[PDB]
Design a protein around this ligand. Structure first.
Ligand SMILES: Nc1nc2c(ncn2[C@@H]2O[C@@H]3COP(=O)(O)O[C@H]3[C@H]2O)c(=O)[nH]1
Length: 149
């Protein structure tokens, strides 16, 4: 399998960097000059199957939300608060009814600098000072590099 095996790597990060939920959106564009984001797998937890992640998906605009900024350039960026930022999509908040305190923005690409999708993980954590460290950003892009293909 090539779809189920990709989920196996997703469970190891849930206990490595300590997170709540994971999602993966793919790049979709039309010939009418219109680009959009549509996640195939929605809501991933430690000890869940693909069948439970294949039901109900979220659709976001291109260069609209927090993932749209990273989706446009293709680099690992940090977000201090998505659902409370001036550049976010409030359509997912309607169905998810969840407010994150911090979210990591990291795009999914294949070897050659070619992008295919975007990876974002929302995990509510408490702390004073900064949002994330430089060592935590390397553990996110290294796991997607192998699974990205
Ligand atoms: N609760 C929850 N939200 C998600 C998932 N995938 C994407 N999102 C949210 O969809 C949102 C769209 O607006 P955003 O600013 O990109 O912030 C995005 C995320 O917070 C998921 O699997 N679970």
């Amino acid at each position: 399998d090539v779809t189920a095996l990709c989920h196996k790597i997703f469970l190891h990060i849930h206990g490595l960097i300590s997170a709540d939920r994971y999602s993966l959106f793919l790049v979709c564009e039309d010939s009418s000059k219109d680009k959009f984001l549509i996640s195939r797998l929605f809501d991933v937890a430690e000890g869940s199957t693909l069948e439970e992640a294949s039901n109900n998906c979220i659709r976001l605009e291109w260069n609209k939300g927090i993932v749209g900024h990273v989706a446009a350039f293709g680099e690992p960026l940090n977000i201090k608060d998505a659902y409370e930022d001036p550049r976010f999509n409030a359509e997912v908040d309607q169905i998810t009814g969840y407010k994150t305190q911090s979210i990591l923005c990291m795009p999914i690409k294949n070897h050659r600098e070619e992008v295919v999708g975007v990876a974002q993980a929302i995990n509510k954590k408490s702390g004073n000072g900064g949002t994330f460290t430089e060592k935590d950003e390397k553990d996110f892009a290294e796991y997607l590099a192998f699974c990205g293909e």
